[PDB]
Structure 1
Amino acid sequence: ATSAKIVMLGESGAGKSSIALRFTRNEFLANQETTIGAAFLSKTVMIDGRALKYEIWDTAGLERFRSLAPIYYRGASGALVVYDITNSESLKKAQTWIKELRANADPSLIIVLVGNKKDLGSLRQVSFEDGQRLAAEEQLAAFYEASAKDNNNVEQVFLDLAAKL
């Protein structure tokens, strides 16, 4: 297996931990304390060419302080910037995380935007096009809407990354 460090980013409550845990363990946990999610998760996948070990880094709740350590970002091949489609403020802050990620990691980083909790259709505050516009303005690698809870569109986010690595 060749390894790629992939970092989760985005506002508290967006679903970072739940996306990482859905992809790696095919589980979903409700109302978990922000500081208790595993900081480091992994899954090895057979892509075209090769076995790829995703080394997924999660925040351990430290984004509550609105900053993350240089070290978190350093050596990432990829980044998932997660917002909550039910929370317009979370999409505004996604753009802040994209600028921090660009300040701290390689210019070659693959950056993906993910609008999570699409299962909460009644509470939606931002449109698909809101997220697509941000991905266009910031020239990101990809944009998806997903549900960590229903396991809708999570696997695809990570497999599409492989390609670009």
Structure 2
Amino acid sequence: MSSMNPEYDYLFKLLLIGDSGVGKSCLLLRFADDTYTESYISTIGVDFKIRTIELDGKTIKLQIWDTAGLERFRTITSSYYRGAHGIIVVYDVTDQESFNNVKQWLQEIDRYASENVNKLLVGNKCDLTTKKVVDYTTAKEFADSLGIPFLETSAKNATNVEQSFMTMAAEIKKRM
């Protein structure tokens, strides 16, 4: 047994990672604050927002962390992954390089995250269809090849944004 806060049953620490400009801050802001903006401020270090949700009648508190995607604020060893309950790997569906680097983000999870942490591949900017480069089938083939759930999304138009985070919260509850 352990102490339990009356407001929330489960504290699920989520973490967003991915190349710069993939839309991690936009996704975090759209989910935790229903706001979006064209002004780009490159994240440094860490940021987090808390959002309380409900799934299967359980009050779930999500602490979603947004890590800096730029080369200069990244390091080989990382201690942000430590204690994450689930990790979202974001990529920009309009930039194949961000999708290719997903392979490299995954190996960071297998090295520093919890041994069986939940993972979720997210393809932000799905609203730029005239500029999209990856196929949904190309991503699904890759996500399923590793068993990680996947949802294409758009922070701009809220498209699947809520569902992406809600899905990982459910998956973590399923894990524990």
Once the two structures are aligned, what percentage of the paired residues are identical? 37
TM-score, normalising length: structure 2: 0.86
Contact 2:18-2:90 at 8 Å conserved across structures: yes
Tell me the equivalent position of 1:161: 168
Aligned-pair RMSD on alpha carbons?
1.8
Point out 4+ residue stretches in structure 1 off by more than 3 angstroms.
65-69
Paired with 2:49 and 2:29, the residues of 1 have a C-alpha distance of 8
Tell me the equivalent position of 2:4: none
Gap change, CA 1:53 and 1:84, over 3 Å in 2: same
Structure 1 counterpart SS, 2:116: coil
Instruction: Kindly state the Cα deviation for residue 114 of structure 1 after the two structures are TM-superposed.
Output: 0.6
Instruction: Kindly state the Cα deviation for residue 69 of structure 1 after the two structures are TM-superposed.
Output: 5.0
Point out where structure 1 has 5 or more consecutive residues left out of the alignment. none
Deviation string, structure 1 residues 124-145 (Cα, Å, up to 9, x no partner)? 11100111122123221x1111
Please identify which structure carries the higher helix content: 1
Q: 1:88 aligns with which of 81, 96, 120?
A: 96
Gap change, CA 1:69 and 1:44, over 3 Å in 2: farther
Paired with 1:94 and 1:31, the residues of 2 have a C-alpha distance of 25
Deviation string, structure 1 residues 78-108 (Cα, Å, up to 9, x no partner)? 1110001110111000111011111101122
Instruction: Kindly state the Cα deviation for residue 38 of structure 1 after the two structures are TM-superposed.
Output: 6.8
Point out where structure 2 has 5 or more consecutive residues left out of the alignment. 1-7
Give, as a single letter, the amino acid of the residue that structure 2 aligns with 1:115. G
Give, as a single letter, the amino acid of the residue that structure 2 aligns with 1:47. L
Report how many residues are paired: 163
Paired with 1:136 and 1:38, the residues of 2 have a C-alpha distance of 29
Instruction: Kindly state the Cα deviation for residue 36 of structure 1 after the two structures are TM-superposed.
Output: 6.5
TM-score, normalising length: structure 1: 0.91
Paired with 2:35 and 2:86, the residues of 1 have a C-alpha distance of 22
Paired with 2:12 and 2:40, the residues of 1 have a C-alpha distance of 27
Paired with 2:76 and 2:144, the residues of 1 have a C-alpha distance of 25
Whichever of the two has the greater Rg, that structure is: 2
Task: Pick which of 35-44 and 117-126 moved more.
Answer: 35-44
Contact 2:18-2:69 at 8 Å conserved across structures: no
Gap change, CA 1:52 and 1:112, over 3 Å in 2: same
Contact 1:7-1:58 at 8 Å conserved across structures: yes
Instruction: Kindly state the Cα deviation for residue 159 of structure 1 after the two structures are TM-superposed.
Output: 1.2
Gap change, CA 1:136 and 1:18, over 3 Å in 2: same
Instruction: After TM superposition, list the pairs within 5 Å mapping 1:114-129 onto structure 2.
Output: 114-129=122-137
Tell me the equivalent position of 1:143: 150
Tell me the equivalent position of 1:79: 87
Give, as a single letter, the amino acid of the residue that structure 2 aligns with 1:156. Q
